C-alpha cells in the first residue's frame, strides 16, 4: 500500500540488457549529440559554414568509420541527426546499426535560470517527454540523456539547496519517464570545474549532489539496473594553476562514487568537460588499474573523442580518411582505459 | 551566501498590491478557463455545438454582464479567451477591463500520470513558462492559475509520497516564475473528492498536502505576500450518502488551513468541486461567520457560478438576459458569503 | 492509513486552554530557569555566594512579589526549584499558585557538538523524557521548554543543513511526547545574535528555520494549538555598532513570523537575549502597535525582566522590597507592551 | 564553506581498518549483549536462575571457546559483560583478546513509542553517548551496536514516514558520534518479520528503509568505510505457511542491498532474527555463491549462534564442553557460509 507499482519484468530486462551493452567492458559512448548551435562553436574552429550539408557529412564521418563499434558501444544523437541522412543518402541511425553501435538521443530542452538564483539552473523538457521517448524509441534509439549543471562558488553558497533539489527532481522524473518508454536514461548532473577551488572541495560537493540524486531516483522507482551515470570526474577547479595528478583524479573520482553509488548501477560513464584527450584518457585508465570495480567505469566522451578528429578533418572531404584514423586512435585509446591497459600516447 | 536573492521591491509590490486586489473584501473569482474539452462538456448539456463562435459569445454573456465587478474581483481565462473577440468585436480582456475585473490566465498543460504509481498525476507546463509568462502579462493577464490533482485512497495509500512531493515542486516552481514575470499565482493543489472517506480523513490529507506546499514554497523563494491558495474545502468524500453539515465543513475547512497556512498569505480562495451552487456559497458563508480571519477566504468558482447561468442561456440569444441575471444572483451570493452575511436562497 | 493517531480531545484541551491561559492578553512569562552554573554569573555580579540557600532566597523574592500574577501568566523553572522550598519553608509552586501563575519545567539537558560541524550544537534530553514529563506534571508544572541554538556566519555557511535539521528534528520529537504527558510545550529554537550580520540576514535565517521547524512539528504530530513558539526577534547581530531601530526590528520580527508560522499556534513569547530591559520592551511594544495579530506577540523574558532586580537586590535581605518593586516595574512595563501600550521608561 | 569538517585521518584509518577486521572473511560476530531482561528468557528455556553468577558463567562458557577466533571476528557484549569477570576471576574482555575476538558493545538504550504512533518505536540513547563511548573504548571495546526497529503492516500503512525518518536520525546521529569516539558503528535498521506479507513486500519495505538509513548517513557526515551494516534478510513475514526458499532469500536480500548500499560500505552482518541456526547458515551461504559481492556479505548472529549450545549446556556445568562443541559447530557453519562454502548439516 503505497508503494511503487512494479515495472514490467519485460521492460525491465530490456533496459538492463541495454545498459550492460552500453557499459560493455572495452567500450564506452561517444556523445554527439551537440545542438545547432553547440556544432557552430566547433565547426567555426576550423572555418566551416553550419549547414545542414556539413552537419551530415561531419556526423557522417564519424558514424561511417570502419571499425569504431570495437570500442564505442553506443552515440548519444541530438535529434536532427537521429532523423537525418549521411550524404550518400544513407539514415545515420543505419550507420550506427552497420557497426552495432546502440543509437542513443539527447531528450532535455536546455537550461533556464531557477528564480531569486545567483544564475543558477534548472533542465527543462519533462513536457512532452513521454511522448517523444516513443517516438525516438520507434526510430531506434535505446538509451537518452539529460543534462544537469551545478556550479561550485563557496563564496555563494553555490550549490545551493535549490540548485541540488531541483537538478535531483528533474533527472529522476526525467529517468522514470524515459523507463516507462523502454528507454536507459542515462543521468548526467555535472558539476562544472569553474573555479579555484580543490580538488577535495569538488570530492564534497560530488558526494553530496550524488546521494541527492541516488535518493530522489529511488523516490521515484528508477530501475537503477536499467540506468546509467553521467557524472563530473572529481578534479580541482579550472582556474587552478596546477592539475591534480591522474592518480589524485583517479584516487578521488573512485571513492565519491563508491560512497555514493548503489553498485546495482551497471556503469559510470564519465564526462570530460574541459579535459584534453590524453587527460581523459589517462584519468580514465588511472581509475581502471583501481579496479576490479563494483560497476564498469568508462567514458561519454564528445570533445575528448571529436578534438584531432576535426582538426583533421578541416572542412576539406579529402581530409576524411585522416580524420576517421585519429577518432579511432581515440576511440581506441578511452577503450583501453576502460580495461586499465592505455600505455600513453588511502584519503578518508 | 546561499540564500535566495532579494525579489525586487517594485515587482513584490505590484505582486502583493494585486493579490489583495484579487482577494478583496466581498468579492471573488469566476473561473472560466474551462479547455475546449471541458467545455464541450458543458455546452453538451445543453444541446450547443462547440463553435469558437458559441465560446465567444458565452464568453461574452459572462464577462459583459452588467456589475459583475461589484462581486467578482478577477477572471480565470483559457489562452484562447485571452486572446479572442466577442461577437460585436469587442476584445474579452476589455469586457474584463470595463468590470474593473483583473484578468487572470490558466498556464498549466494538464496531467500525465507519474510512472509506476496507481494513476497518480504530475501536472505539466513548466517548459516556456517563464516566456508564456511574459506574453500574458503583455496581454493583460495579472495572475495565474496552476492545478495539481491529488487522490484519496486508504486502500492504496493515496496521496502517496511521490504524488505529494511532485506536486509540491511543480506548484512551487510554477510559482517562482510566475512572480518573475510579474504574475501573481494561484496555487491549486487539489485533493479530489473521489471515495467513501470521512470529513476527518479529508481534514488529514489536506493539513499534510498543504503542509509539504508551503514548504516548497518557500523552499522556491516564493513570496507569500503576493500568491494565492485555491484549496478544496475539506468535505466527506463524494461516494458518502450523508454530505456533512455546513458548520462541519466550515469547521474542518479553517481548521486545516490555520495549521498549516502562514499568515502572510492574503488569501484562500476555495475551489467548489462537485458542489451545488447553494452549498458552495453556504459553506463559504459558514466559514467567514467564524470570522474575523488571519488571511480573506474567498472563493473561485466555475461551475458553483455557472451551472445555473448556463441551463438559462440554453444556446439561445434571447435568453441571454435571464442568463446574466442568474449569474449576478450567484456572483452576489458569493460576495455577500465573503463577507459571512449571505441569507441563503472544538475538535482537535 | 498511516496518519497519526488522533490526539485524545480531553489530553488536546488541556494543552490548547493551558497554552491559551499562557499567552493572556497582557501577560508574558518569568523566564527563571537559570541552571545551577548559569545562576552562579548572576550571582557573581553582585557578590553573592551560590548557595541553595542564596538561589531558595531569590526564587523567593521573584515568585513571592505581590501581584505579580497580573503581569506574568507563567514561570519557567529549573528542576531544582520546582522542587524546592522558599527560606520560609514555602514551596515555590505554591507561591505560584498564589498569584495565579502556572509553573513551567526547562526539560533539555544542554547542548553537544555535532559531529564534524564547526561547533554547531544539538540539544540533548529525549532520553527519559517522557518519565519526567509525567513527575513533572505530578509536581504542578503544566508547560515545559526546550532551547535550541543555531549560530549565523556566512563565511561558513553556518547554520548548516545538518544544524538546521537537527534543531527541527530535536524540538518536534520533545514537543510531541511533551503532549502526550499533558504540557504544553514551548519550542525555543534560538538564532544567536553573534557577528556582524545585517538585520536582513537575520530575517532570512529566521525564516528558513522557522519553515523547517513548523514543517517538523507537523510530520511529528504536534498540535499548535497546544503549543508555543519561544524565537528571537529579529535583529542586527551583535557585533554591529548600530543597533536596529525599534521600528525595524518590529517589522522584519512581525515579517518573518507570519511568512511561516501557521495561526493555530496561540503564542508567540520572544526572547530577549542579550537586549536591555528596555529595548525589550519597546521592540515588544512596537510589535503590538502593529496589531491586531494572527498570534499573541508577547514575552519570556529572563534577564529583560530580572536584570534590575538583581542589582537592586545585591544578596542584601533589606534590598528585598526595593527589588521586587524594580521586578514589577519591568513585569508592567512588558504586560503594557504586550498590549500596544507601554509608554517608555513594506520591505519584501 | 557549510560542509563537514574533514574527519581525523588517524580516527579515520582506525576505523577503516577495524571496520575491515570485522568483516574479514570467513569470519562473522557473535552478538551475545542479551540484557538483564532478554537473558532471563533464554536462561529460563532451561531452568536457569538469572543470577549475575549464571550470566558470567554462560559469557565466560561462549568467550573462552577454544579456537572460536578462527570464524568469530568480534563479540557485541552487553555493558555487565564488558566489565565483569568470569568465575575463575579473568576479565571478559580478556578472554575475547586471548581469541584475537574484538570486543563491541551495545549502546542503544531500548526502545519507546513515538507519539501518536500505533506503536511505533524511536530507539533512545543519545544522552551521554559520546560519553559512554569514550568510557568503553577505554574499556577494550572498538566497536558499537546500536539497534532500530521497524513493522510492516500494509493495512496500518506501517512502517510510517515518521517511524523511518525517526530510525534513519537516530541511526545516523549514532554512528557519528560513535566515529568521533573510534569506535565502529554497526548500523542496524531491523525490519521485524511479524505479519503474513510477501517476500517481495518485505523487499520493497527494506529498499525504502535503506535509501533513508543511507541518505541520512551522509547529510551527518558518517564514513561509511569505518561502518557496518546489520540488516534483516529479506523474507516472507513471520505468519506465513511457507517459507521462502534459501535461492529466493539470497535473491531478493542481495538485490535489496545492492540498490541502495554504496560500496565504501566494508560489510553487512546480517541479523538472524527468528529463523533457525541451519535457515541462517543455508540463508548466508546461498548468498556468498551469487559472489564475489561489492561488500562482505557475513553475519552478526545471537540466538542462530548459540541456540543448541544453551540447550547443551542446560545449567550443567559438566555440560560446558559439549556445548562449547556445537558453539564451534555453528561457528564454523557461518564462517563456512561466508565463503559460500558450507556443505549443510533475475527479478526486477
Known sequence: S???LPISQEVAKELAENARKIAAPGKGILAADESTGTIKKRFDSI???????????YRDLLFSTKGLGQYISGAILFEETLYQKSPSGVPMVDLLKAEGIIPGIK?????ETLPLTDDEKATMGLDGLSERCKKYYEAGARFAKWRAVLSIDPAKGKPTNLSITEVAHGLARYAA?????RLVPIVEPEILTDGSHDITVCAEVTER???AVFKALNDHHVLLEGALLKPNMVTHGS???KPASHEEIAFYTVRSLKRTVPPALPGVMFLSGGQSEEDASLNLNEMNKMGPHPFQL???YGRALQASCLKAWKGVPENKAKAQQVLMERARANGEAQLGKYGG????
Do not use: H
Not at 519517464?177 to 518508454?181: D, E, G, L, S, T
Open 298 to 300: 568508462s567514458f561519454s
Open 239 to 241: 582556474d587552478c594553476p
Open 107 to 111: 531528450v532535455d530542452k536546455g537550461l
Open 209 to 211: 549532489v550524488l546521494a
Open 2 to 4: 503505497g508503494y511503487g
Open 345 to 348: 600516447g588511502y584519503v578518508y
Open 47 to 57: 572555418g566551416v559554414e553550419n549547414t545542414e550539408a556539413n552537419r551530415a557529412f
Open 177 to 181: 519517464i524515459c523507463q516507462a518508454n
